[PDB]
Design a protein around this nucleic acid. Structure first.
Lengths: 335, 228, 335
DNA sequence: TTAGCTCGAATCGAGCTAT
DNA sequence: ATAGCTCGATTCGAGCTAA
């Protein structure tokens, strides 16, 4: 009957590194290895109430009393220096083979169907579309999440590494390649076999991904934010903390991986909004609506049952999605 | 074992298990609705009333924090100097005519706020009692901070009926008021079987919604709102 | 039935940088790129009892005892050099655009109608009145808050920095363009479509604003103040702390952006005060009160629901206030 | 604002249960 | 006290007329 195993833990492929930030100036991007790092400092903010009220009653004295004692906060803030207008973000992406092999399972019969159905998938169509689409999110600076909304010109330079030296260098203009359309380009195509060879297990791939963005002169850069333990008084609340590795602003590695995973364009709703991240139950917390509802037969879990247990193969664009949850890893299976 | 439901809280166990030491063990997870507060690994030999006692202190701390951060504003009645507090009353909303004030001698009684930029209003004892009657706060008025503003509004067009989880905040054995479903039904003058349909969850067959008058009268009788 | 969204987080437009302050003498502002920065130094003060007493400390024995036990505290002080009378503040302002699009919004139906409402506003009239009042606040040294109340001659220079170079230059007189009325000027209107293009989203735009002010020799300059953790001794209380980035006094970014936000003249109350900032509930920190209270139905939130949900659009001057608050950005929706 | 009326849908009470 | 059920009777909302 080939029941589903209890544990389906999968190793994460396309493993990124923490993208630390450094600051500098444009046209000096070649000798940017000695650029000063972006430090995270503290500043005090004061503000009045700007959120909605309870709206049950219309007392004016209470809202005026909130202006009598404005809230005082200290927030972690990261800014470029007054002599720098370019933000440098560098991280390394490690590409691993053996996508279909689970890290932990609970049935040898179940695994042998999984490793066979991903072999028949790769033989029919290998790691070509996903590797191409994972190349798009490295081409455009999607990992520059809020550092791309108003950049004058953001440039991505990635170098393939062998033995500790460059193998082949790619140079891209991230404004040219949009965040919506998955077009075709020769440098984008040439990057695809490198990702394809690493994903198929035929070779090792290490890429050093560098992004230079024209944020502006002394403007604000936006690293990842940490949790607030709320162990201080209401005035020194420390309401915002930013992630720094060693006195240098940095972006969480899982936030970088989320930008790479944004290749899903076959969710059941209208796809003109834009790509979403490949993820079970197609859920993104920005708009708060989860595409690929399990009530519909289009989420990752039910197709994984049809594509394996009862051998009901979906459309080939969906089989790219089912392996897209396998390549990103995850703790699957019924607990 | 079974998911223990304590009012708006729900202690659900992990489907899988573990063996810490040699004894059987399970992961119990406290929930405040969709919010996760704690994971505690516990043996399988504990009863439900003992896992409840194990998770009771975190619930007590949550209730203390909710009562403190949603305490109603306190007004102070002072003399013509502002030093002696003759009477204090907690209010659900401030008086309409409050402005920044420092008491003087021309009026004997002043109604100041407890906040340090003290707003105030010159009143006599009769007007002070009128304001206290109009604006008083019920003893359990802090539970309104844990409820949405569209289920507590008095405007019928903008009012939304509370859900089962929002209803568990005020009725139930492990609720923030501590009144049973039978006592709440007796307060509304209805049968307990009909109120259990209000408090029913995940049972789509025969589940009902509370009405505007019933909800606001229940909030009146429990001491949560409209008890000035 | 088109209920409003529970989360309506909006990105802020008109993002300013930190305003660095350096000092010098007048008539050398054409070559002010090597002026020494206004340094932060420390001085000690003592004061007498100048506060009201709670009817018990007014006793002559108790009052004189407080004078015999003086309050010694150190304060943070910033002054110009004795040979310098000009204060310049330099910040960069970038205009983003796409003000109608929220970062987070639950209801897709509400997002489409809100985007339709913003697009309906843009077609009727563009961001011309908005940018005219925004450039008016850039024309005067309103962002130079307390260093303008006694300025003898204050002058601003605004430069359009497109490709890291001055694409178009501006020079205004801040005292002539007062902080009371929003008149029309050909040079101001030339700046108006520069921000209006940024607000519309046609192309990237970035400005640099330098404001020279005739302060006086060694006079007191007023940067933004900080919070004190209040942990040290009472003698070294540090009752005042000012903001600095690198041994140079500076003004907070949100302090500068608040002054550029000061375009709201449409609040129902009498105009003895003048323009205020466009933030919901019309809060004025200095006066401790709030114009546009929800009771008289002229705050941001009631106008937004009237414009979007039940389709009763407000007055055209009130539509400017709503979009300006939409440009201002905030955490809207039922938090 | 008074004074009603269908019509399907949701609610109400009082019987039972289960834990 | 929790949790939930069925079944016939009563209530409920949004149409409508009628004045």
């Amino acid at each position: 009957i080939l029941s589903t195993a209890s544990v389906l833990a999968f190793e994460r492929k396309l493993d990124p590194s923490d993208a630390l930030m450094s600051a500098g100036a444009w046209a000096q991007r070649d000798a940017s290895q000695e650029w000063p790092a972006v430090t995270v400092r503290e500043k005090s903010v004061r503000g009045t109430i700007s959120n909605r009220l309870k709206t049950k009653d219309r007392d004016p004295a209470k809202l005026d009393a909130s202006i009598q004692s404005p809230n005082l906060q200290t927030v972690d803030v990261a800014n470029l220096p007054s002599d720098a207008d370019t933000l440098k973000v560098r991280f390394t992406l490690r590409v691993l083979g053996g996508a279909g092999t689970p890290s932990a399972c609970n049935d040898a019969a179940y695994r042998d169907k999984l490793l066979q159905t991903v072999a028949t998938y790769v033989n029919d169509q290998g790691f070509a579309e996903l590797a191409r689409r994972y190349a798009h999110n490295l081409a455009n600076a999607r990992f520059l999440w809020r550092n791309r909304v108003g950049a004058e010109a953001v440039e991505v330079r990635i170098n393939h590494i062998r033995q500790g030296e460059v193998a082949r260098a790619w140079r891209f203009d991230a404004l040219a390649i949009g965040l919506r359309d998955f077009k075709a380009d020769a440098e984008l195509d040439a990057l695809a076999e490198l990702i394809a060879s690493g994903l198929s297990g035929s070779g090792h791939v290490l890429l050093e991904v560098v992004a230079f963005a024209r944020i502006g002169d002394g403007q604000e850069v936006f690293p990842s934010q940490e949790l607030i333990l709320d162990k201080g008084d209401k005035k020194g609340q420390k309401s915002k903390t930013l992630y720094s590795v060693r006195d240098a602003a940095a972006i969480h590695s899982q936030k970088i991986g989320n930008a790479l995973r944004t290749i899903d364009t076959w969710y059941p709703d209208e796809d003109g909004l834009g790509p979403i991240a490949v993820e079970p139950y197609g859920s993104v917390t920005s708009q708060g609506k989860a595409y690929r509802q399990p009530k519909q037969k289009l989420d990752f879990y039910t197709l994984l049952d049809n594509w394996v247990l009862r051998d009901e193969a979906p459309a080939v664009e969906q089989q790219h999605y089912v392996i897209a949850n396998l390549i990103r890893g995850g703790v699957f299976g019924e607990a | 074992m079974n998911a223990i439901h304590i009012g708006p809280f729900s202690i659900t166990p992990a489907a899988r298990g573990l063996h810490y030491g040699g004894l059987p063990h399970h992961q119990w997870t406290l929930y405040y609705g969709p919010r996760e507060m704690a994971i505690k690994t516990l043996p399988d030999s504990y009863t439900s009333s003992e896992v409840r006692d194990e998770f009771s202190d975190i619930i007590a701390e949550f209730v203390i924090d909710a009562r403190h951060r949603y305490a109603p504003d306190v007004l102070e009645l002072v003399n013509s100097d502002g030093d002696a507090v003759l009477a204090r009353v907690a209010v659900s909303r401030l008086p309409e005519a409050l402005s920044g004030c420092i008491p003087d001698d021309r009026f004997p009684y002043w109604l100041l706020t407890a906040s340090r930029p003290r707003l105030g209003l010159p009143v006599t004892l009769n007007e002070y009692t009128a304001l206290a009657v109009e604006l008083s706060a019920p003893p359990l008025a802090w539970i309104t901070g844990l409820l949405p503003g569209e289920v507590l509004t008095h405007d019928a067009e903008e009012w939304r009926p509370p859900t089962s989880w929002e209803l568990r905040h005020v009725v139930g054995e492990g609720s923030f008021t501590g009144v049973s479903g039978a006592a709440a039904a007796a307060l509304l003058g209805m049968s307990a079987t009909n109120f259990r349909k209000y408090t029913a969850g995940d049972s789509a067959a025969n589940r009902q919604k509370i009405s505007f008058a019933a909800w606001h009268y229940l909030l009146d009788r429990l001491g949560v709102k409209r008890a000035s």
